[PDB]
Design a protein around this ligand. Sequence first.
Ligand SMILES: Cn1cnc(-c2nccc3c(O)nc(OCCCC(F)(F)F)nc23)c1
Ligand SMILES: [Mn+2]
Length: 308
Amino acid sequence: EFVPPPECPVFEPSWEEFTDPLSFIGRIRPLAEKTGICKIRPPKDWQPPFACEVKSFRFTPRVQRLNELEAMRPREAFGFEQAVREYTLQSFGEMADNFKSDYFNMPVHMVPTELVEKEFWRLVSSIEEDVIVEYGADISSKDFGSGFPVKDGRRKILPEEEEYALSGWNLNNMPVLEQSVLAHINKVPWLYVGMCFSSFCWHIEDHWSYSINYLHWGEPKTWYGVPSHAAEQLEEVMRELAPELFESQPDLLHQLVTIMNPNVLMEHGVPVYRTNQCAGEFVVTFPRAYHSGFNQGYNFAEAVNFCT
Ligand SMILES: Cn1cnc(-c2nccc3c(O)nc(OCCCC(F)(F)F)nc23)c1
Ligand SMILES: [Mn+2]
């Protein structure tokens, strides 16, 4: 059965260290760049309100077949495996909790994170059991607003929430403009509504950017990270073991299907670290740090690429 990778670093900044995100990330860099990902727990009294327009939040999540890659005599009428469904935040959550409690035969919060992790990787490699989930992924914060309060006049901000609209840890206030000569000659956060087993495969960011992720609420998001010094090692293991039909694809396309059990990387000498990102916690990914993960249950995350 699956062997959990070692835990990535977790930082608990004091109020003083919490003042400036770029300064803090710069200070922790000597350790965190050696693990690829790290977790940051804000001070206990730092609790931004959830600011999305919830009544109008409607979306059609994408369908994910956990074993699609291992499952490569074509099946009868392939391409029509699942019906299309639109949800609200509420109806997706009801669907998500029902799925998970039915799958594990227990209340959703009683399922151990280690068990969901073990079962996720078993299902990904299983050809006898076909599990299909849904992921509200890559929803633009322009659509229904950010999960953070924003002083753009589209939604009311209470006085005690203004500090969150102005916080440097509000993902809308991260620097996103890369320096270039072209910038003189001449992005917003994305939202992720997860359910149990919904997942993202191994990838790095465009321009090898940093990224930061905040889990607004819900069950944890489980991460795996590889430090940038092992990027070529991971890419070589992928080339050796990925399906030949996809081996020659450019990286931007190959990264759509680069699912790989962390133990396979670890067996080939790739350092891998893990974490469970819980509600109210940040995950930072460092430049060219490969990362992948899956959701433990119904949750809501916001992410953006930033530059230093
Ligand atoms: C484009 N992109 C760049 N980085 C990511 C990413 N970075 C950190 C965390 C992520 C998380 O939690 N979820 C997803 O969901 C993406 C959907 C994937 C599917 F459905 F196609 F398989 N992406 C995350 C996405
Ligand atoms: Mn990413």
